[PDB]
Symmetry: C5
Subunit: 263 residues, 5 copies
């Protein structure tokens, strides 16, 4: 299956940013959701599309390989390393833009509370498994959500399989990486839950993640395409009124790739 | 007596989900407990079965071998559905006027084990006068000494939806043939911190390079993943649990 | 003079649990203290015996040996027993809010363990030198205001159970050459317990010279405190709650002169 | 093309401190911002200059290299190591002046809440990317801010490129290090957000950061100049009235450099 | 100094001692505590009482006389805070956390600091408020200006006296202290929990990147410490700093120098 690395135009780099998809409720609110409203009963949960943060995905074309007929073997791009970080972490220091004061005469409350920080690099679409907080939640038109939901969907219903293959579509609260698949992807995520959780965001151009498995093989890019996926829900912004909106930020990716021969 | 590892047909892998057992108080509430109620005295503590999270267990039959035994070498594991806890809109309690719903938070217990036989348990009671309900398996002949250590309370995790998390722990005096890991984080306001990655492996070999050996060609997987409590609009609180993924690599080992 | 390790009959293991000594104020409350009450002044601080957690200790005899041979402690596995009991939030606790669950055990904790070839050596330090400690405890005597920072008179051995109150004694860092000790104080009213359990973790007890505790008279000394925090009952009154500690120690025969 | 390190006057050291630039609202309040005011609407956000912390920067001249004509080769100073620390951490124990009591008869509230701790060492100016919390924020005269802002500026507008080439000018909340550039700079930053986050400030003269990349090459100093950049927003001070001011501290740098031949 | 070979064989010595804390000691019963903390109405009126100000602790330890000369080189340190369990006294004139509750424990701003040097710790002055009037009996930054709130290079001192150098206006000078190793953490916040570790198993190596430790000038070793653990809240709500002693064990060896 996997043979030697090519040396000597044998390496390439992908550098890009993925924008967040927090719901964008009007022309002025890119990076924010709609304010969160709470259903009157548990069974009537019915979130609007613009209140639901979704997974981000980019498919990046790589230099075309195998332009001439080959015999029993091909080249594939192998993703070897990743640098990543959240872009615009200092924007969360704006505590003066019509937020809710911490106390009388105080500054605005900063973005804080529940966060999900997630990134993946793969040679194909991230494979997802559905899990629902509430199987009677009515998910809205324009989203791709677990179908034929049962009470078992609240813990594990193996019917709920999907590919992260569309932007602004797969709600964060419905889907996770499928650990039974993703052989050709490396994924990393942290959920920090709680209304008062402080954002802790590190930036450096000195940190590298190695994407090689225990056999020294990185993701292999099918069709000369690289799949990047992210979520960076940083917390909620609290308006003067008390209403709360999810706030997301963009994620930087730099991936180094090498040509690998495979049978 | 443990001899050489077979090479070549000599490896297998187990992959599965263990669903949580939080109490499931009605046909809509898989993954949740009944809302929690408080006794007015220690002597009147009588929790209903559907208010008690229990240990999860699966006995997984392996390919029949016979001697040779399956040896568990490595584990990948993670909690499945961590993002579901971002639902802050399903009739929860607003943090403040016009605010979002309070997220799942508070006391958690995250636990998993891999063994070649049932997890061995030791009983310890918060309150020795607690009356545990019909259909649970609980420390019997409890005394005030049961609040710190009573060696009578020995059991095997040999039944699903049976062994309440609050009365049992892994027995550190046994479990020679099991590897176990758990963390209790206590407090009504503790934030869930849940990591997911397909790049993390736990090695199950002891200091002598021997992994759990599967008696009768059976692998035992155990879990608890109490994530915290959900607060309803009324203020009532239910435990919330999530499923745990296990991938175990095994190899054939000659013994005796 | 420490000489060679014996190989081959050369090894033994000790396995046991130490119960917590929290004060046990009645026949139903083993593992709890009395409810905490507060003095009106520093000079009137007068805590009752059943309100003071104490250090736990076991002296464990080893196989008789008699360059001479001595038992050398090399490795320790340890963990808190019954961490999941702290999930009982339905037993006369104070609701965290209207219709809510009981407040779990939380706040000030002390988790400590030591392994030695002789009794743990203690130094007394008092929060308040005017505290009147109760009959049946062993406490710093002839206390002065200097006892609030460092009075070298306050030297003791942890040589008795249910006796040495946690708040007036610490391991003496000027002694304890023949013991290995480890402790964490986490202070504050709302601190969450964080309790880890696993049978895969070992502590090596060898010093920088490759030498472990050497057991005088073939006795091993195990000490512990596991104050996990406070339990708040329906009335708001607070009690210390403790749990037992498991120890497993591997020992080997060492020749000495 | 990087060649061999010169040995033997082949080494030099830079030592200095960067003062913080928090806004300095009067002649007594060096190191503090103006008290924070909250806009009446999200659209009307218009912070005053003395309410905005800015990035700090110093450019340090090194011993002059290449005084004689050379042929195809030059020497450059290469930055190899950094010692850095926040100067004055114990000042935050002043809880006895002009403060708001934590409770009846209690001590003053200490400096706490949102912090940004950042430093960089480079052979040229730090390259910046603009990200705005609110694209309709009116930034004040005397600051250098992202121009021609659009709603996209709330997540990622690639027009917003700058150099940290002026002190007291680039607002912290507008700008981050550009991860798509900065090949010749090493940067490190942490945003800890939240109204009540406690400052955690470590000092030691025993800690060293190595500035070499994966090829053993540090920042190379163009024109024999070293660029140091810092932000140390420690949190907010709370007045008796409840009014809150950012508080910053100075940062110490010690950089060891060696002469490197390059072709 | 040219640093030459280490002596082997009579070539080692050790120093073991404790430094008491200096929190202000406002009466004959309150050793280890400051005076209750009060709040001036303005920066201009900030006039802290001497017994309300914690100070750096220092000990100069004479070593065995040695004298191309030999100097004692500090190689390793074991250190810990003494009496951590004393903070479990929540029954002594404390403010109840809630109705019928236990006393509020020591919590809030802490500073834990220690240093080992072959000469006095070098200090740099930094003022929260340049208009603070430091009291008679303290050694404080002189000729303060508004620049003293960020960096005024005039404010240079030696930690050369006890009960003198207030913690809040002095830090180790990072521009000097070549011949010292220093370590400190400030943990701010009104409600921060103390987290105090003890063990006799932890050693700090004091050698720099060239394998050289502090070299003791005139055969004197300088130990310095601060252990402000947080504040104690009494029944009225008034708050006092509380400190604890620090243990030091330093191993030293003879080093030839020119
Ligand atoms: C997640 C969830 O289900 N939340 C609900 C919660 C839980 O189901 C229980 O607490 C689990 O033990 O129940 C809440 O209501 C408690 C009361 O229910 C009343 O019945 C209602 C029911 O709640 C409605 O949904 C239904 O449409 O109508 C019923 C009225 O006939 C009972 O009569 C009353 O005794 C309580 O049990 C709760 O607040 O605890 C509602 C949560 O949404
Ligand atoms: Cl000499």
């Amino acid at each position: 299956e996997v043979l030697e690395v090519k040396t000597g135009d044998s390496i390439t780099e992908v550098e890009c940013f993925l924008t967040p998809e927090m719901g964008d409720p009007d022309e002025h609110l890119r990076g924010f959701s709609k304010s969160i409203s709470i259903s009157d009963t548990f069974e009537s949960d019915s979130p609007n599309r613009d209140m639901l943060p979704c997974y981000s995905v980019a498919r990046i074309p790589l230099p075309n390989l195998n332009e001439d007929l080959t015999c029993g073997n091909i080249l594939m791009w192998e993703a070897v390393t990743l640098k990543t970080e959240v872009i615009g972490v200092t924007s969360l220091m704006n505590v003066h833009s019509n937020g809710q004061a911490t106390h009388d005469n105080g500054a605005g409350k900063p973005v804080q509370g529940t966060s999900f920080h997630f990134f993946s690099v793969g040679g194909e679409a991230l494979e997802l498994q559905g899990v629902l907080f509430n199987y009677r939640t009515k998910y809205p038109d324009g989203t791709i959500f677990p179908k034929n939901a049962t009470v078992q969907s609240q813990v594990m219903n193996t019917e709920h399989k999907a590919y992260l293959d569309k932007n602004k579509a797969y709600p964060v609260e419905c889907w996770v990486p499928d650990p039974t698949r993703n052989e050709n992807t490396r994924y990393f995520g942290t959920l920090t839950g709680g209304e008062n959780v402080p954002p802790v965001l590190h930036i450096t151009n000195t940190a590298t993640t190695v994407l090689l498995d225990e056999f020294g093989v990185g993701p292999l890019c099918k069709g000369d395409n690289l799949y990047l996926s992210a979520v960076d829900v940083c917390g909620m912004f609290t308006n003067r009124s008390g209403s709360q909106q999810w706030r997301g930020l963009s994620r930087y990716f730099k991936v180094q790739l090498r040509k690998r021969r495979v049978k």
